[PDB]
Design an enzyme around this catalytic site. Structure first.
Site, PDB file in Angstrom:
ATOM      1  N   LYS A   1     -11.399  12.533  -4.730  1.00  0.00           N
ATOM      2  CA  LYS A   1      -9.774  11.841  -4.279  1.00  0.00           C
ATOM      3  C   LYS A   1      -9.430  10.998  -5.190  1.00  0.00           C
ATOM      4  O   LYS A   1      -8.171  10.783  -5.200  1.00  0.00           O
ATOM      5  CB  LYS A   1     -10.136  11.323  -2.600  1.00  0.00           C
ATOM      6  CG  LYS A   1      -8.826  10.563  -2.120  1.00  0.00           C
ATOM      7  CD  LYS A   1      -7.788  11.672  -2.111  1.00  0.00           C
ATOM      8  CE  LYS A   1      -6.410  10.766  -2.307  1.00  0.00           C
ATOM      9  NZ  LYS A   1      -6.367   9.812  -1.021  1.00  0.00           N
TER      10      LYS A   1
ATOM     11  N   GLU B   1      -2.031  12.587  -9.709  1.00  0.00           N
ATOM     12  CA  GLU B   1      -0.683  12.409  -9.040  1.00  0.00           C
ATOM     13  C   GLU B   1      -0.076  11.084  -9.618  1.00  0.00           C
ATOM     14  O   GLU B   1       1.138  11.354  -9.672  1.00  0.00           O
ATOM     15  CB  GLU B   1      -0.856  11.887  -7.319  1.00  0.00           C
ATOM     16  CG  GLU B   1       0.045  11.029  -6.927  1.00  0.00           C
ATOM     17  CD  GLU B   1      -0.344  10.285  -5.723  1.00  0.00           C
ATOM     18  OE1 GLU B   1      -0.757  10.878  -4.793  1.00  0.00           O
ATOM     19  OE2 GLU B   1      -0.398   8.946  -5.855  1.00  0.00           O
TER      20      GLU B   1
ATOM     21  N   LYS C   1      -2.272   0.663  -5.779  1.00  0.00           N
ATOM     22  CA  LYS C   1      -3.420   0.220  -4.604  1.00  0.00           C
ATOM     23  C   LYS C   1      -4.839   0.731  -5.494  1.00  0.00           C
ATOM     24  O   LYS C   1      -5.994   0.249  -4.325  1.00  0.00           O
ATOM     25  CB  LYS C   1      -3.309   0.683  -3.344  1.00  0.00           C
ATOM     26  CG  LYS C   1      -1.826   0.261  -2.799  1.00  0.00           C
ATOM     27  CD  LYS C   1      -1.673   0.478  -1.102  1.00  0.00           C
ATOM     28  CE  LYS C   1      -0.429  -0.158  -0.714  1.00  0.00           C
ATOM     29  NZ  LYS C   1      -0.229  -0.146   0.800  1.00  0.00           N
TER      30      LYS C   1
ATOM     31  N   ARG D   1       3.368   1.558 -14.893  1.00  0.00           N
ATOM     32  CA  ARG D   1       3.218   0.751 -13.675  1.00  0.00           C
ATOM     33  C   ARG D   1       2.959  -0.765 -13.901  1.00  0.00           C
ATOM     34  O   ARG D   1       3.641  -1.645 -13.373  1.00  0.00           O
ATOM     35  CB  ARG D   1       2.424   1.191 -12.790  1.00  0.00           C
ATOM     36  CG  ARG D   1       2.601   2.682 -12.036  1.00  0.00           C
ATOM     37  CD  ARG D   1       2.029   2.869 -10.898  1.00  0.00           C
ATOM     38  NE  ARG D   1       2.014   4.317 -10.454  1.00  0.00           N
ATOM     39  CZ  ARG D   1       1.947   4.916  -9.261  1.00  0.00           C
ATOM     40  NH1 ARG D   1       1.489   3.886  -8.494  1.00  0.00           N
ATOM     41  NH2 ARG D   1       2.236   5.726  -8.926  1.00  0.00           N
TER      42      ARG D   1
ATOM     43  N   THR E   1      -7.911  -4.127  18.056  1.00  0.00           N
ATOM     44  CA  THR E   1      -6.471  -4.570  18.548  1.00  0.00           C
ATOM     45  C   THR E   1      -6.132  -3.443  19.604  1.00  0.00           C
ATOM     46  O   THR E   1      -5.547  -2.458  19.032  1.00  0.00           O
ATOM     47  CB  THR E   1      -5.400  -4.890  17.607  1.00  0.00           C
ATOM     48  OG1 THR E   1      -6.036  -5.947  16.615  1.00  0.00           O
ATOM     49  CG2 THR E   1      -4.161  -5.350  18.368  1.00  0.00           C
TER      50      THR E   1
ATOM     51  N   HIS F   1      -7.767  12.965  -7.812  1.00  0.00           N
ATOM     52  CA  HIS F   1      -6.513  13.499  -7.290  1.00  0.00           C
ATOM     53  C   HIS F   1      -5.238  12.487  -7.565  1.00  0.00           C
ATOM     54  O   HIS F   1      -4.141  12.740  -7.923  1.00  0.00           O
ATOM     55  CB  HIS F   1      -6.611  13.903  -5.875  1.00  0.00           C
ATOM     56  CG  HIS F   1      -5.205  14.128  -4.953  1.00  0.00           C
ATOM     57  ND1 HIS F   1      -4.686  15.215  -4.879  1.00  0.00           N
ATOM     58  CD2 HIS F   1      -4.641  12.961  -4.659  1.00  0.00           C
ATOM     59  CE1 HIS F   1      -3.644  14.907  -4.265  1.00  0.00           C
ATOM     60  NE2 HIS F   1      -3.497  13.589  -3.790  1.00  0.00           N
ATOM     61  N   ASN F   2      -5.618  11.110  -7.061  1.00  0.00           N
ATOM     62  CA  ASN F   2      -4.518  10.319  -7.162  1.00  0.00           C
ATOM     63  C   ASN F   2      -4.341   9.880  -8.687  1.00  0.00           C
ATOM     64  O   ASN F   2      -3.261   9.580  -9.200  1.00  0.00           O
ATOM     65  CB  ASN F   2      -4.897   8.864  -6.329  1.00  0.00           C
ATOM     66  CG  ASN F   2      -4.625   8.974  -5.118  1.00  0.00           C
ATOM     67  OD1 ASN F   2      -4.979   8.159  -4.239  1.00  0.00           O
ATOM     68  ND2 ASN F   2      -4.070   9.947  -4.604  1.00  0.00           N
TER      69      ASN F   2
ATOM     70  N   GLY G   1      -0.936  11.724   3.381  1.00  0.00           N
ATOM     71  CA  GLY G   1      -0.277  10.499   4.140  1.00  0.00           C
ATOM     72  C   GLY G   1      -0.259  10.922   5.601  1.00  0.00           C
ATOM     73  O   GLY G   1      -1.104  11.479   6.338  1.00  0.00           O
TER      74      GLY G   1
ATOM     75  N   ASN H   1      -9.674   5.563   1.255  1.00  0.00           N
ATOM     76  CA  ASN H   1      -9.774   5.559  -0.380  1.00  0.00           C
ATOM     77  C   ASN H   1     -10.666   4.517  -0.690  1.00  0.00           C
ATOM     78  O   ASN H   1     -10.434   3.276  -1.024  1.00  0.00           O
ATOM     79  CB  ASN H   1      -8.332   5.266  -1.020  1.00  0.00           C
ATOM     80  CG  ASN H   1      -7.391   6.646  -0.820  1.00  0.00           C
ATOM     81  OD1 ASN H   1      -7.880   7.841  -0.391  1.00  0.00           O
ATOM     82  ND2 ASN H   1      -6.002   6.458  -0.946  1.00  0.00           N
TER      83      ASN H   1
HETATM   84  O1  LIG Z   1      -3.125  11.524  -1.689  1.00  0.00           O
HETATM   85  C1  LIG Z   1      -2.266  10.818  -0.855  1.00  0.00           C
HETATM   86  O2  LIG Z   1      -2.018  10.932   0.194  1.00  0.00           O
HETATM   87  C2  LIG Z   1      -1.657   9.458  -1.369  1.00  0.00           C
HETATM   88  O3  LIG Z   1      -1.983   9.495  -2.935  1.00  0.00           O
HETATM   89  C3  LIG Z   1      -2.692   8.123  -0.617  1.00  0.00           C
HETATM   90  O4  LIG Z   1      -3.741   8.163  -1.372  1.00  0.00           O
HETATM   91  C4  LIG Z   1      -1.726   6.838  -0.881  1.00  0.00           C
HETATM   92  O5  LIG Z   1      -0.242   7.242  -0.930  1.00  0.00           O
HETATM   93  C5  LIG Z   1      -2.222   6.341  -2.168  1.00  0.00           C
HETATM   94  O6  LIG Z   1      -2.159   4.554  -1.948  1.00  0.00           O
HETATM   95  C6  LIG Z   1      -1.065   6.388  -3.394  1.00  0.00           C
HETATM   96  O7  LIG Z   1      -1.610   5.618  -4.341  1.00  0.00           O
HETATM   97  P1  LIG Z   1      -1.107   4.286  -5.109  1.00  0.00           P
HETATM   98  O8  LIG Z   1      -0.655   3.390  -3.718  1.00  0.00           O
HETATM   99  O9  LIG Z   1      -2.003   3.611  -5.754  1.00  0.00           O
HETATM  100  O10 LIG Z   1       0.365   4.443  -5.615  1.00  0.00           O
END
Ligand SMILES: O=C(O)[C@H](O)[C@@H](O)[C@H](O)[C@H](O)COP(=O)(O)O
Ligand SMILES: O=C(O)[C@H](O)[C@@H](O)[C@H](O)[C@H](O)COP(=O)(O)O
Lengths: 468, 468
Positions: A182, A189, A260, A287, A33, A185-186, A130, A102
């Site tokens: 990664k 997180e 996600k 969640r 696009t 890491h999440n 982000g 991801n």
């Molecule tokens: O490291 C990061 O910058 C975030 O974690 C990035 O990967 C995104 O925000 C993910 O989508 C969050 O995870 P969820 O959407 O599953 O909460």
């Protein structure tokens, strides 16, 4: 000719393109696009930066310096494979594809073998931070071809977040190890966010803190050992006023958590490989339970949650400081699980992961960034083969000093019916992993009883079956 | 000619052959190694039964009445598919293959498709009960072809365990639904064993009960509402004296739990579908942690677990009865998770599972068998649309009367550093599922802050993104 190319121009790809351009590299971009390509060039000239936009992938590839390097920032799905297939029609031996989304690590393993059939090198790279980190400095977790890493590492070093002199990037390892790091890491997180939210309900419902008092406590915590991005933005979130009502904005948000995939993937890996990650399950449980909002409401209409009236004789002095120590204690426990998972998987995959390097590049750019990660980095720089994080001498002393505060928090939350699955799962994990003797002897006896699965003895070798 | 045939003559297959013969049916058997086929025939002689052995599969197939039915009791692996193909070289349209092993349900789906292309009906059947159940009466969970079920139903009904005159068999549903139900049975079984083992460690280390008193308590519980196979054999196990030493046998058993997949599969399924099963995680966490016996020993040497000194003025009156009520409460909560998993998976797979019928056939034969399951079957037969088990009126009353006991148990275990992950996970699950408002609002605000994932509001429609 362009130093590097980038396909996929959502806000993420746009900001990374501006980041690369602002560091002196000439970059060509493409997006099916075309208006996203136009938006990128517009933003570039508004900031006095140069970004070259092309209407086709062929024109972009033709303008790339050799060895050709292209970054992929496309939403996970068949559109990634469609772009790779199209790129492979114009790439030659020695060219490089870098996937920055991801991704599930098994998928990147398939794409590595497919590209290698055409002698094209593949770099599966996790990116954390982000839209803001993509623009000003993120954490890069590239894995795959070391040759590919070397050809692009100057760009990654300059565009990543800087912690002092140290860029937040490292060569993770071969194959899909970058996606795997990664993903973890999440997962970590997820755990930090669930622990913070449980601290939020503990002060709200036991200490009766209003949102202003809550924001102050988190800001006070951000000034000490808990200094972190998530603690910082939590303090900002709790003070935010709504502009559609006269309430606090966080009180107007529906308590249905999105997700996600990366948290679920971490859990699937821990389960499949038999690596215990209880704090991970607690964060996912929260969640997944939150999704059933209507069922939760009807369930509470049958099991009424009475308002918490604290015993007037309840010993709650220093309770706020006990919660600080408990939350820090849980982070040590939660990161122990995540780093243990990375260590075992690295050994099983022969990835030779450098946990000190991974902790180092998590000190900035990424979401779990914190001075806490510099302590972890130092622990692994001193003992590269550390089995459990809290077995390091300094972390061990932290546990021994802060664990009574953790027990106090779990006690009070249990007494007043506050659900704290991540806090209690973290305390249970520490108690089990530090127990030489666990009640699995009874489990083994039962399994031999009903299944004749046999058991081992403590006093002699061999497998034994008993006629109970 | 033979009414049915059986392939695979381990102790499970031998006993089922004796069972089928004892109920009046003419059965032929085959095993790859002929030594087991002889052994089956000698044992049949010794028990005044007749089982016909065959040296090859062709002779067995030739001696089967039409429609030909063959039972497979082969260890999970390629040998199952090898025997299926070998059988398909001799079966005709309308013949039936019944697989009775602990199979992963996706693998059965594949085998159902292949057999259907040859017009051979397939029945994937879960079997629970162990060696004793195979001989005298087990729980059959057959799914797949309804035509195949109706042709083999009388053999299954007469050979299953009988609760009164009700046989422990039912048509589970289409496809591999029978393997899935058996898998979830083992998942629930994992949870029951972990909860029982936490009751054991609570009484042992808080109440200082020795094994003779422990055995008496479980025997006492088996006389009341907790009447169940697992409670009964737990009493026997704790009283069992070792014959190699003068100690109790359970104290000589190494605390490393085995596991052969079905519990892990249940957790993988719950994780992938986002269905919260916290008690299953605690059961798996405990087994997985136990494997790290050497690390656990080293960990306790650094984190010395002090002697549990109970406060002399600690109110432990009715504590044993609180534990009874707490364990019963956790079983309600744990079965709520497992039955919710079965319900959601039934919806997603379009299996139309009859939860009342599944609970009915779990009253005997299987490992989790208990009078508890008659209450469950009655709850679903009274309300086939029941969503959560503890929302049935009589189970709801049990929770209200017994939940304070569960809080008291978790409180005392927390105070004296007893790891009870299943008890605490069960309590956390209940408190979250029955919470109209959960702290996932803070999580949603964080995800919008750092990832621009948007959130929903409680007072109006739409997805909102805030510049925090
Ligand atoms: O490291 C990061 O910058 C975030 O974690 C990035 O990967 C995104 O925000 C993910 O989508 C969050 O995870 P969820 O959407 O599953 O909460
Ligand atoms: O229902 C049964 O009769 C048992 O559960 C049976 O399936 C077997 O004993 C399993 O192997 C036990 O499970 P684990 O071996 O994984 O503990």
């Amino acid at each position: 000719m362009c130093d590097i190319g980038l396909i996929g121009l959502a806000v993420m790809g746009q900001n990374l393109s501006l980041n690369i351009s602002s560091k002196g590299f000439k970059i060509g971009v493409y997006n099916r696009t075309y208006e996203r390509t136009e938006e990128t060039m517009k933003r570039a000239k508004e900031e006095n930066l140069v970004v070259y936009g092309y209407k086709t992938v062929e024109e972009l590839i033709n303008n790339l310096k050799k060895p050709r390097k292209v970054i992929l920032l496309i939403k996970a799905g068949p559109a990634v494979d469609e772009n790779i297939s199209n790129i492979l029609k114009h790439f030659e031996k020695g060219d490089i594809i870098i996937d920055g989304g991801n991704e599930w690590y098994i998928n990147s393993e398939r794409r590595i073998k497919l590209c290698k059939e055409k002698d094209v090198e593949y770099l599966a790279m996790g990116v954390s931070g982000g839209e803001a980190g993509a623009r000003y400095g993120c954490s890069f977790m590239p894995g795959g071809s070391k040759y590919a890493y070397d050809c692009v590492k100057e760009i990654l070093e300059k565009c990543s977040a800087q912690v002092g002199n140290s860029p937040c990037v490292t060569y993770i390892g071969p194959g899909s190890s970058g996606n795997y790091v990664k993903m973890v890491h999440n997962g970590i997180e997820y755990g930090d966010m669930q622990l913070i939210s449980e601290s939020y309900v503990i002060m709200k419902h036991i200490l009766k803190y209003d949102n202003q008092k809550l924001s102050e406590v988190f800001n006070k915590w951000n000034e000490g050992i808990l200094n972190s991005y998530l603690i910082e933005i939590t303090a900002n979130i709790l003070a935010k006023k709504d502009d559609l009502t006269n309430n606090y904005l966080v009180d107007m948000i529906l308590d249905i958590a999105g997700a996600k995939g990366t948290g679920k993937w971490t859990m699937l890996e821990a389960t499949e490989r038999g690596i215990p990650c209880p704090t991970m399950c607690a964060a996912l449980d929260a969640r997944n339970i939150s999704v059933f909002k209507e069922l939760r409401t009807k369930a509470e209409s049958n099991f009424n949650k009475d308002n918490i009236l604290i015993d007037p004789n309840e010993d709650l002095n220093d309770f706020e400081n006990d919660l600080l120590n408990a939350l820090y204690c849980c982070k040590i426990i939660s990161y122990t699980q995540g780093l243990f998972l990375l260590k075992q998987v690295s050994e099983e995959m022969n990835w030779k992961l450098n946990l000190g390097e991974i902790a180092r590049i998590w000190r900035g750019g990424c979401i779990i960034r914190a001075v806490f990660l510099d302590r972890i980095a130092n622990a692994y720089k001193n003992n590269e083969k550390l089995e459990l994080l809290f077995l390091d001498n300094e972390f061990s002393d932290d546990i021994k000093n802060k664990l009574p505060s953790l027990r106090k928090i779990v006690l009070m939350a249990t007494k007043y019916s506050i659900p704290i699955p991540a806090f209690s799962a973290s305390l249970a994990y520490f108690q089990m992993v530090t127990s030489q003797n666990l009640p699995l002897n009874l489990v083994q006896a039962q399994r031999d009883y009903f299944g004749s699965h046999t058991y081992r003895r403590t006093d002699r070798e061999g497998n034994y079956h008993t006629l109970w």
